[PDB]
Design a protein around this ligand. Structure first.
Ligand code: MEV
Ligand code: MEV
Ligand code: K
Ligand code: K
Lengths: 302, 301
């Protein structure tokens, strides 16, 4: 009676920060996944990298919210959930959405809730609102369904036959403060910054055709433009620049911040034959590197 | 023994976008080219590069300055000595300065009687002669000085700030960089042309911030301008390291000055944070020049 589910993380090819101002973005699930194993138990126990708890909204807020929410439809007396992940809690890789979706998947399987993927993505959205007070459905949608998806129209795009090199600066990045900083900048210089958001949106809409045609060189070129605009919005840091420039010099098609910035990770779109060379340059410049690829697979019952 | 000097300049905002009709703001800095002009036997010019006569290869600007000027007042012997504090490249203005200082030093030793605008026009056309083509910007800013808007040429109040210039020592072809931006603009005109508009809008806003002395906001707009230059593809790792080191050490702002691809960045700092910023830039590997803005254009020393 041992069930396991996994859900992937994601990167932004284009358009982070500008979505909340009405602009288009392109997200891409990657083959770094969070796994949740679930078992019948006498009590509620959650174990992850930060230890073992019961219901605990300081250490395990997403998993605990999932259990509380789902126990209202089919009562859950006890359960043992074990979480392990390749997604570092730290950047714009979607670690919160992955454990949320994987937790819902595991309990759906274990207790026979019979939820559809669409229902799961919607429930995962509700959980993140519960935990964060407000949240966009994007993270939990991409983790449920995988692949490449535009935001907010949710067009599904051809998954690139590409390497993806993620470089983690190890700097803790607080998404809400960076989002608030960008808002203050926009407020300070509205006629200047709002067109900058339009440009980021334009990049995503150009990028769509390039994703569909598989022009990874052109995609990387536009990723580099996008990186500049993100730098202009104030969310780049020295460590991110160094990883990004080191990836480019090693032959990446393009490299940029993914997610909120201010720390966290960058992403380098790389031909497969150049993944190691790119990864080595990024590690050499001080980055904790992960080599991965896009995935079409969202929530999976392992 | 006559002595004259003219300064270099940095861009506060607007490089790369002037050629697409947008506004820039330049700032003359207290880095100058001093030429001493005196009478001797033969036309002789001494610089760091060495001692020659009329030589349009080794001393192209000084020699072209002598060539044009003797046509209206004969010079048969000069002893022109040239020293400069101005680093080369990065649009810092070393050629414009050596030009203006020479014109004004020969005009002081000999006759001529030029006006300041007269000085600017001859310097600009001397650059035309030597480089083939040339913008009047560098020669005007070197002559009049202070803070100058481009192209409207309005003067603005000199900010009371430190100016840290960090040289990456990386060489870059300005013609090749300008062409790469032009190509990118042609590839994605609907995307890149609005970025050039944004650079101009920064200059329009920054003009008001210079007038009010809001150095903090000037720096913030410098940091936005730098992201746009990075988006246009003219940034590199060494420029970024210097720029972020200056910001973390308290600069109001830091950005590329000039064409990019290498060359120099500039940091605007409070006067009391200037050596702190300079030390951080040097520790990031930059070749640092510490300076400040200058009201003074061409000055008879
Ligand atoms: C920075 C942001 O745009 C994405 C962070 O991954 C925040 C958001 O869109 O909700
Ligand atoms: C890129 C550019 O605007 C700055 C070089 O000084 C080119 C020019 O002004 O001639
Ligand atoms: K959790
Ligand atoms: K120069």
């Amino acid at each position: 009676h041992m069930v396991s589910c996994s859900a992937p993380g994601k990167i932004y090819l284009f358009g982070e920060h500008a979505v909340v101002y009405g602009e288009t973005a392109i997200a891409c699930a990657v083959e770094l996944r969070t796994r949740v194993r679930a078992e019948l138990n006498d009590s509620i126990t959650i174990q992850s990298q930060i230890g073992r708890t019961g219901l605990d909204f300081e250490k395990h807020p997403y998993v605990s919210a999932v259990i509380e929410k789902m126990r209202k439809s089919i009562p859950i007396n006890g359960v043992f959930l074990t979480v392990d992940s390749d997604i570092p809690v730290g950047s714009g890789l979607g670690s919160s959405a992955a454990v949320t979706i994987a937790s819902i998947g595991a309990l759906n399987e274990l207790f026979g809730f019979g939820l559809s993927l669409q229902e799961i993505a919607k429930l995962g959205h509700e959980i993140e609102i519960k935990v964060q007070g407000a949240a966009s459905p994007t993270d939990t949608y991409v983790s449920t369904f995988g692949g490449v998806v535009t935001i907010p129209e949710r067009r599904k795009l051809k998954t690139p036959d590409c390497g993806i090199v993620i470089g983690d600066t190890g700097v803790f990045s607080s998404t809400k403060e960076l989002v608030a900083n960008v808002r203050q900048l926009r407020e300070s210089y509205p006629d200047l910054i709002e067109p900058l958001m339009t440009s980021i949106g334009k990049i995503s809409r150009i990028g769509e055709q390039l994703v569909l045609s598989g022009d990874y060189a052109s995609i990387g070129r536009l990723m580099n433009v996008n990186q500049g605009l993100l730098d202009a919005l104030g969310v780049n840091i020295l460590e991110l620049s160094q990883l990004i420039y080191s990836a480019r010099a090693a032959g990446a098609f393009g490299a940029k911040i993914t997610g909120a910035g201010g720390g966290g990770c960058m992403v380098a779109l790389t031909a497969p034959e150049k993944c190691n060379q790119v990864a080595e340059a990024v590690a050499g410049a001080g980055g904790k590197v992960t080599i991965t690829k896009p995935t079409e697979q969202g929530l999976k019952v392992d």
